[PDB]
Structure formats: structure tokens, C-alpha cells
Design an enzyme around this catalytic site. Structure first.
Site, short mmCIF file in Angstrom:
data_model
loop_
_atom_site.label_atom_id
_atom_site.label_comp_id
_atom_site.label_asym_id
_atom_site.label_seq_id
_atom_site.Cartn_x
_atom_site.Cartn_y
_atom_site.Cartn_z
N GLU A 122 -66.76 20.89 -6.37
CA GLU A 122 -67.56 21.75 -5.50
C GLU A 122 -68.64 22.48 -6.29
O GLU A 122 -69.73 22.72 -5.76
CB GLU A 122 -66.67 22.73 -4.73
CG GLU A 122 -65.61 22.09 -3.84
CD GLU A 122 -66.15 21.45 -2.58
OE1 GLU A 122 -67.33 21.67 -2.23
OE2 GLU A 122 -65.40 20.70 -1.92
N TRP B 209 -60.09 -8.39 13.89
CA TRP B 209 -59.88 -7.24 12.99
C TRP B 209 -58.70 -7.46 12.06
O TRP B 209 -58.84 -7.31 10.83
CB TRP B 209 -59.65 -5.97 13.82
CG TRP B 209 -59.75 -4.70 13.03
CD1 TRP B 209 -60.86 -4.19 12.43
CD2 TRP B 209 -58.69 -3.78 12.77
NE1 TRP B 209 -60.56 -3.00 11.81
CE2 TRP B 209 -59.23 -2.73 12.00
CE3 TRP B 209 -57.33 -3.74 13.11
CZ2 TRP B 209 -58.46 -1.65 11.56
CZ3 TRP B 209 -56.57 -2.67 12.67
CH2 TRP B 209 -57.14 -1.64 11.91
N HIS C 132 -63.05 9.69 10.54
CA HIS C 132 -64.48 9.46 10.41
C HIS C 132 -65.06 8.62 11.55
O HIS C 132 -66.13 8.94 12.08
CB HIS C 132 -64.77 8.81 9.06
CG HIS C 132 -64.31 9.61 7.89
ND1 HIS C 132 -63.04 9.50 7.37
CD2 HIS C 132 -64.94 10.56 7.16
CE1 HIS C 132 -62.91 10.34 6.35
NE2 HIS C 132 -64.05 10.99 6.20
#
Ligand code: NAG
Ligand code: NAG
Ligand code: NAG
Ligand code: NAG
Ligand code: NAG
Ligand code: NAG
Lengths: 198, 596
Positions: free
Chosen positions: B357, B459, B487
Site C-alpha cells: 500500500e 466452459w 470481480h
């Protein structure tokens, strides 16, 4: 005052003690151009011009001869042959509020660059395009004076800095703003070199 | 006068009146995150609405300036960024439907609670109720039950929603002069107008396949070793010739393999490089962790943290009374205000996160000189990569010995390096086939290569072909198995992890070569090297002003993403895995040989 409408105070008919300003630790910038701070307390000048305004932290560098920026071109322009001192200090304590201090404005656009020691307080709509602005703020026509945002949690390059620029000029009129002359203790009954009032 | 001067004045007007509004929005968001109160939520919503409306009005004004009459690269880039319609080009009914679909998917994913039938009095949420079960259980049927039940509920709810989502996003993208939503996502890496450094949207898929073809042998050897270890752990379920069962990879979806380090350890008897006890004995506070990170960044030549960072950041948990989000996040609020919101504990993970960070903070500080709309990374990969390199450098034993956290007489033998590299491979290499397969499947869905009735049959066929993971039981078209991940369900790009992973080791090789390290790449520390910091800061200062290809040329000397630094990083591990896989069979079969 705001940088667009910077206050000019003429200082005359008194004794200017410059050692009080130089020895203060409250100033971040005390950059003198054309003269040195040590001999300011001795020299004498006809008048002292004190120009006062507030700018950002990153814009203190532009108050110098030969610089380029929004402040130099559109707000406050210094001559190349300038003799004087630029004093700047951080004012986050006074000029910043939690909601945002928007009382300070700057000229963002002008058709031409400012002359040295010029003040522009016009509030006419800037014409950036061929179209006639006609007084209305629409497309390609912007207001030249933009407010500043001052918060106490901002970075050091965005915090408000109070700048006072002292301009020293010598004219044919007798110089009345002189530095303090000082005085030693008087010694009598000995062969000494005396300097009484010059 | 001219179009270029009009655009430059308009961009100045935008940056000036957009920095303050962004600062207000960011400050409201910070006040919400450190203080979860209803008035803070209202203030955040009001600031966000003002920000969005101002961006809509500025975009509407920005579109009136034609792109072809502007020759300055920076002005053209900012105008290109501002002139994007986004969802505005779509009709109000369809835009509202898309926003409603996104919000309802967010609520379904966030508030989804699933538990076993016949015992419904209390249920467990995904975080942390199901995460702990996936990461720590050793029971086959319990993990199978949790995986199938969560995909049953979430997929059956989300399948019509996803069917509407693909059509709406494709409609919006085609209205915005794109082929599909996949092209819209791939447009982030598009470079146009620069001689020699141009990059096309179509080139990204080809480059990803070209890199993945070289990824595949290392992944095959790693998969074979993990398969052998899982066969040892579970005697009958795993087949020597087939794929791995889906629910045994240590995570809910298969995103990371980092939870299998205990099961797949090469040398369990040998110690780890855990430094938690050393910090506990010496009473290391979170402030000391950030000061050590700051010392690391000044060691490499980068500027130190501002006074506002130390005064305004929250580096300790506030208390029971005050609620805060625990996720570590670096906030660039605007006007030179950089803060880190992390509930820092005395752990190695928090220390590495603090370095990551603070790397984000350094990256944000570097491009502060740039205009407001160009204050971002050159691409989505670089922003995470600059933090990941700090995470890599901080975790080395040399850095720990240098900063005093490790004993100076600790013996660094080959076995510890092998097991540490295997853990790094499970975290980093293992995510690459899953990321590539998911992004390729989504691109084919947006492109129309796969019809709606054949989404899952392809898939699983992709997952067997690429990931080497087989379904426990066959799934029909009533399931929506991809959308169970955070996501994809919340409209986020997923190729950032793949690009970040390749850029991470490319940057690591460039900085280590700059720092004159003469050994293995994984044993390299970038502390005390001014030239490496200068080379990094040259790219860091640019931000989004220059193309990512030019930035990559600035750092590594290459005009395209490369796969050789990753293979060089894991070369000792690659040789070790090749030696250890002589008896076993490398590679997998796409048939239903283990279980179906
Ligand atoms: C958090 O919010 C509460 C309630 O509004 C307030 O009393 C408190 O001062 C806040 N604390 C901080 C650190 O903002
Ligand atoms: C483009 O505009 C920027 C202003 O942000 C200016 O500094 C730069 O010199 C310009 N570049 C060219 C090639 O005109
Ligand atoms: C944005 O939408 C407007 C109107 O729908 C259109 O005129 C303009 O060309 C669009 N711009 C882009 C970049 O799609
Ligand atoms: C950051 O570095 C500057 C110059 O090296 C120094 O003056 C300043 O004190 C440092 N900041 C802190 C918080 O130590
Ligand atoms: C580590 O080095 C020793 C000494 O050469 C060797 O005997 C051993 O096999 C090596 N182990 C690995 C995993 O390479
Ligand atoms: C890097 O510099 C610091 C301070 O100059 C020093 O204490 C440290 O030991 C150096 N690193 C190495 C690996 O020598």
C-alpha cells in the site's frame, strides 16, 4: 487579499527594521532578489511597496523574475530587473477551514500576459473561441476569476501560503525609508573616533 | 482561437473544478470508510451524485471538440478519456435496467447465505463462513456440499440476470463504436497515434496466448506435483491420468492455490521464514511497521511520506464502538492528500501489505505533477505491479536480516528456497490459467463465439483444457458458475492480475539488473540502490501521460509484455519439479477419468 486583487501598501516616512523579519523562524521563504538581507538594515530607500496576497504551496516558486505560470502571467507579474524580497509563509492555521475556504480567487485566463506590477480586477467573461460571448457563460466562454479551495488536511503543495513582496526603489526625491542606524555607549575623556549624525 | 487552444483552456477549467469536487467525494468516502454512520453514507451519496453529474456535463461539453484537429498527445489523451459516453449513449430505460441489474447482483453476492437443507435455523455467509471451510477443511463431501450448494443457489439466481447483462453490455459497447464488451475492456491497452509504440486491441489476446504457451510447461509440472500430493491426501478420488477435483484447490473458485501449501509442502520438517514472533517479542507497533517501510523507500531513493499522511491515516483499529472497513486501501484523496486505511496487525501479511500500500502511495505521489485526468497508471497492470515489487523485495530473507527482524545467523539453504518458491508459485503461477481461461471465456461470450445454450459445456471443456480442473458432477444450463466470483459479478475487469503478474517479474528483473544483483532473481533485494529507484521513478513520474509500451521500454527495455522474467524467477523450482515428476505423469486428460 486574493492574488488577483493583491493589496499594495506604500511604506514611507519611517525607519524600517529588517532584522526583525529576517530573524523570525515563522517564514518558510525569505528569498531576496537584487539585494542581500544583511545590508538591508543599513541601506535607505525612497519608498517600500508591500504587495500582499495568498497563493498555493506549489505556486510560491512563480513569484520570481523570469518565471512562467498562471500566477506570473495572469495574476501577479514581477519585472526581471526587480530589487526586493519575497517573503512567504504557511497559513494553513488561519486561511483553511474544515468546510473549505473559497474566499480567495485567482485569474485563470487573460488574453495577454500582465505587465510588471499590474493589478487586473476586471470581471469580464474570457473569450477562448471566435464566437461572441455576449455576456453569458456557456461554451468556449469562461469566467476569469476562479475560487481556491483550502482545507486543513491538504498536502503541503496545496496549503495556503501568505506572500508579501517588498519592492525597494530609489527615486530623485530624498530617500526617507532608512534602516536603523544603531548606537554604542558614549565614552568621554579619551581620544576616540566620533560619528555624530553623519 | 484554434481548436487546440480551446481544448487546452477547457481541460484546465476541467482539472481545476474537478480536483476540488473529487477531493470532496474522496473525503466523504474516507469519512464513510473510517466511520460507518448513516449521515456519512448520505454525504458520500450526495458527493458521488454531484461528481457523476459534473462528469456528465463536462463530458457533454467535451464531445463538441473534434479529436482530429489536436496534435498534442497529452491534450488528445485527456479529451479521449473525457469524451467516452459510458452508459450515457444507451436509452434511459435500458441504462436504469442495467444499473438495477448491477445493484441486485451486488446485493445477491454480498448478502448470499447458504446452508445445508434440513438444518436451516442459521446459515453461513461467504465471508468468512464459507471461506474458512474451503481453505481449511480436509473432508471431501463437506467441501463438495459447500461448493455445489453455493453454486446452485447463486448460479440459479444469477443466470437470467447474466443473460440480460451480456446483452445490455454488448448493446452499450456497440453503441460506443466497439465490437463487444470484451473490446471495450481491451481498449485500456490500446495505443494509437504514437509511431512504433502502437498497440492494438486484437494484439492483446494473441500476446496472452503467446505468453500462456510458455506458461503451460511450468503449470503442467506444478499441477502434476499438486495432483500427486492431493492423491496422497485423498487416496481414491484423484486419478493419475485425470484432472484435479474442483472443490479441493483451497479456495471457493480456484482463484489461488495458496491454501494448499500445508498439504503440498516439499519439506515440512524444515522451518519457515516467519518473523511474527520476533516482532511480538520486540513490541513492534503498526507505526514501526510503516516507519520501516518508509525507511525502505528512502533507501531506494524515493521521497518519504508527507506530514498529512502520518497525521490523517488510520493505521490501528479504532475500537468496538467505531466501525470501519478492515480491507487495506490506499487513498489518493486529491490536492496532495495521501492516506492508508488498514487495520494493521502484528503479522507478516500486514507488513507485506503495508509495503504494498505504501508502494501504491508512492505511485500516486509520483504523478501528482500531471494533469488531473491523467493522474492514473499507464494501464491497470502497472499500478498493482509497483506494489507487488515492494511485496517481493520486503519478503526476502536478506531484507529481514538487514532490518533486524531475522537472526543474522539464520541458514538459507536450498530447501527453504524451494518451499518458499513453491508457495509463491501456488499464489502467483496458479492464478494465471484460471485468469486466462475466465477472460477468454468472457471474451468469447461477448464476441458471440459461444451461443447461450452452450455456455457451460464449453466452459468446463475450457477448464479441463486450460486449468486442468474437472467438474465433480456435470452441470446443465440452469447454473451460472462463473458469476459466483466477486470481480465478474460486479462488472470488473479480470486481466489486470495476468498483466500485473507478468509486469511484476519484468520490473523485478529490471530493478535487480539495475541494482547489480549477481545471484538468483528470487534472492534479490532492491534496498540501498539509488539507480534502481531512479529508473523506477522515471516511469512513476509519467503516470498516464505516456503509452504503457514506452513506460515498459523505460523500465525493462522491451516494447511488449514478456514471459521470460517469470520463468527465470521460478527456474530453480522448475528444475526441482521436473526432477520430482519422473515417476508421475506430467499433463492431464480432458476425459471424465477421476470423477463425473
Ligand atoms: C465517528 O462518528 C461518531 C458519530 O457521528 C462521532 O461521534 C465520532 O466523533 C466519529 N469519530 C471520528 C474519528 O470521526
Ligand atoms: C501539450 O500540453 C502540455 C500542457 O499540459 C504542454 O506542457 C506540452 O508542452 C504540450 N506539448 C506539445 C508537444 O505541444
Ligand atoms: C457519445 O454520444 C453522443 C450522442 O449519443 C455521440 O454524438 C458521440 O459521438 C458519442 N461519443 C463517443 C466517443 O462515443
Ligand atoms: C522527509 O525527508 C525530508 C528530507 O530528507 C526531511 O526534511 C523530513 O523531515 C522527512 N520527513 C519525516 C517525517 O521524517
Ligand atoms: C540441496 O543441496 C544439497 C547439497 O548439494 C543436496 O544434497 C540436496 O539434494 C539439495 N536439495 C535440493 C532440494 O536441491
Ligand atoms: C541500507 O542502508 C541502511 C542505512 O544506510 C543500512 O543500515 C542498511 O544496512 C543498508 N542495507 C544493507 C543490505 O547493507
Amino acid at each position: 487579499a486574493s492574488v488577483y486583487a493583491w493589496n499594495r501598501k506604500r511604506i514611507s516616512n519611517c525607519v524600517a527594521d529588517y532584522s526583525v523579519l529576517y530573524n523570525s523562524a515563522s517564514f518558510s521563504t525569505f528569498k531576496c532578489y537584487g539585494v542581500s538581507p544583511t545590508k538591508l538594515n543599513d541601506l535607505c530607500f525612497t519608498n517600500v511597496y508591500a504587495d500582499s496576497f495568498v497563493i498555493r504551496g506549489d505556486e510560491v516558486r512563480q513569484i520570481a523574475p523570469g518565471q512562467t505560470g498562471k500566477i506570473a502571467d495572469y495574476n501577479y507579474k514581477l519585472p526581471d530587473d526587480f530589487t526586493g524580497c519575497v517573503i512567504a509563509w504557511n497559513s494553513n492555521n488561519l486561511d483553511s477551514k474544515v468546510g473549505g475556504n473559497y474566499n480567495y480567487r485567482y485569474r485563470l485566463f487573460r488574453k495577454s500576459n500582465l505587465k510588471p506590477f499590474e493589478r487586473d480586477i476586471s470581471t469580464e467573461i474570457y473569450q477562448a473561441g471566435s464566437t461572441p460571448c455576449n455576456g453569458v457563460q456557456g461554451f468556449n466562454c469562461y469566467f476569469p476569476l476562479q475560487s481556491y479551495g483550502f482545507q486543513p488536511t491538504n498536502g503541503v503543495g496545496y496549503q495556503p501560503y501568505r506572500v508579501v513582496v517588498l519592492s525597494f526603489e530609489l527615486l530623485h526625491a530624498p530617500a526617507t525609508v532608512c534602516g536603523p542606524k544603531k548606537s554604542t555607549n558614549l565614552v568621554k575623556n579619551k581620544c576616540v573616533n566620533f560619528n555624530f549624525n553623519g | 482561437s484554434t481548436i487546440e487552444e480551446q481544448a487546452k483552456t477547457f481541460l484546465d477549467k476541467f482539472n481545476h473544478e474537478a480536483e476540488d469536487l473529487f477531493y470532496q467525494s474522496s473525503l466523504a468516502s474516507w469519512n464513510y470508510n473510517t466511520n460507518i454512520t448513516e449521515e456519512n453514507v448520505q454525504n458520500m451519496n450526495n458527493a458521488g451524485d454531484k461528481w457523476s453529474a459534473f462528469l456528465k456535463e463536462q463530458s457533454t461539453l467535451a464531445q463538441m471538440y473534434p479529436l482530429q484537429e489536436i496534435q498534442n498527445l497529452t491534450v488528445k489523451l485527456q479529451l479521449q478519456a473525457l469524451q467516452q459516453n459510458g452508459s450515457s449513449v444507451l436509452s434511459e430505460d435500458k441504462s436504469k435496467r442495467l444499473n438495477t441489474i448491477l445493484n441486485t447482483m451486488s446485493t445477491i453476492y454480498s448478502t448470499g447465505k447458504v446452508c445445508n437443507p434440513d438444518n436451516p435455523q442459521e446459515c453461513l455467509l461467504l465471508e468468512p463462513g464459507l471461506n474458512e471451510i474451503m481453505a481449511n477443511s480436509l473432508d471431501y463431501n463437506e467441501r463438495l456440499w459447500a461448493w455445489e450448494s453455493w453454486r446452485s443457489e447463486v448460479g440459479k439466481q444469477l443466470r437470467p440476470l447474466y443473460e440480460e447483462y451480456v446483452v445490455l453490455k454488448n448493446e452499450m459497447a456497440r453503441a460506443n463504436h466497439y465490437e463487444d464488451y470484451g473490446d471495450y475492456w481491451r481498449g485500456d491497452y490500446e495505443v494509437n497515434g504514437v509511431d512504433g509504440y502502437d498497440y492494438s486491441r486484437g494484439q492483446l489476446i494473441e500476446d496472452v496466448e503467446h505468453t500462456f504457451e510458455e506458461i503451460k510447461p511450468l503449470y503442467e509440472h506444478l499441477h502434476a506435483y499438486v495432483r500427486a500430493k492431493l492423491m496422497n491426501a485423498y487416496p481414491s478420488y484423484i486419478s493419475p491420468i485425470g484432472c484435479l477435483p474442483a472443490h479441493l484447490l483451497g479456495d471457493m473458485w480456484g482463484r489461488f492455490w495458496t491454501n494448499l501449501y500445508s498439504l503440498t509442502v516439499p519439506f515440512g520438517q524444515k522451518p519457515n521464514i516467519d518473523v511474527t514472533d520476533a516482532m511480538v517479542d520486540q513490541a513492534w507497533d503498526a507505526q514501526r511497521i510503516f516507519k520501516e517501510a518508509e525507511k525502505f523507500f528512502v533507501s531506494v531513493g524515493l521521497p518519504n511520506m508527507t506530514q498529512g499522511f502520518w497525521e490523517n491515516s488510520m493505521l490501528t483499529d479504532p475500537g468496538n464502538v467505531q466501525k470501519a472497513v478492515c480491507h487495506p486501501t490506499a487513498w489518493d484523496l486529491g490536492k496532495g492528500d495521501f492516506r492508508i486505511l488498514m487495520c494493521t496487525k502484528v503479522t507478516m501479511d500486514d507488513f507485506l501489505t503495508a509495503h504494498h500500500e505504501m508502494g501504491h502511495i508512492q505511485y500516486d505521489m509520483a504523478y501528482a505533477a500531471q494533469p488531473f485526468l491523467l493522474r492514473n497508471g499507464a494501464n491497470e497492470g502497472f499500478h498493482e505491479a509497483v506494489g507487488e515489487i515492494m511485496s517481493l523485495s520486503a519478503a526476502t530473507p536478506k531484507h529481514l536480516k538487514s532490518i533486524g527482524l531475522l537472526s543474522p545467523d539464520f541458514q538459507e539453504d536450498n530447501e527453504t528456497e524451494i518451499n518458499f518458491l513453491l508457495k509463491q508459485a501456488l499464489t502467483i503461477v496458479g492464478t494465471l490459467p484460471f485468469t486466462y481461461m475466465l477472460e477468454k471465456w468472457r471474451w468469447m461470450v461477448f464476441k458471440g463465439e459461444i451461443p447461450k445454450d452452450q455456455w457451460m459445456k464449453k466452459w468446463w471443456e475450457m477448464k479441463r483444457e486450460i486449468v486442468g480442473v474437472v467438474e465433480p458432477v456435470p452441470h446443465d444450463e440452469t447454473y451460472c458458475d462463473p458469476a459466483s466470483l466477486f470481480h465478474v459479478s460486479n462488472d470488473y475487469s479480470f486481466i489486470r492480475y495476468y498483466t500485473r503478474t507478468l509486469y511484476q517479474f519484468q520490473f523485478q528483473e529490471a530493478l535487480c539488473q539495475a541494482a547489480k544483483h549477481e545471484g538468483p532473481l528470487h534472492k534479490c533485494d532492491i534496498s540501498n540502490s539509488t539507480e534502481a529507484g531512479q529508473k523506477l521513478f522515471n516511469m512513476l513520474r509519467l503516470g498516464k501521460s505516456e503509452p504503457w509500451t514506452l513506460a515498459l521500454e523505460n523500465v525493462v527495455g522491451a516494447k511488449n509484455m514478456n514471459v521470460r522474467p517469470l520463468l527465470n524467477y521460478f527456474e530453480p523450482l522448475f528444475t526441482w519439479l521436473k526432477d520430482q515428476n519422473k515417476n508421475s505423469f506430467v499433463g492431464w486428460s480432458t476425459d471424465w477419468s477421476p470423477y463425473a
